[PDB]
Amino acid sequence: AITADDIAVQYPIPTYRFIVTLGDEQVPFTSASGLDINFDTIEYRDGTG
Amino acid sequence: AITADDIAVQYPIPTYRFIVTLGDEQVPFTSASGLDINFDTIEYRDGTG
């Protein structure tokens, strides 16, 4: 008794369905990877700790 | 009435009467199997379906 309108709210989304709008046109692709958000790290230590 | 010249047109064929021509000679065999026609399968899926 999950009543699949609640699946569209509460269950995770799989990966195998995706559209790729490339500029102004949609192009069919098989894979799409590397869409990360990465930062660098700045550190500073003194003698007091 | 089935008039056996019609049996030679529209009835199926049994498997006990066969001649094996082996190169340029006839050789009597008891069994014969494995004369298959098999293909492989190419598949391709995109994200649109």
UniProtKB/TrEMBL annotation, chains A, B:
<protein>
    <submittedName>
        <fullName>Afp1</fullName>
    </submittedName>
</protein>
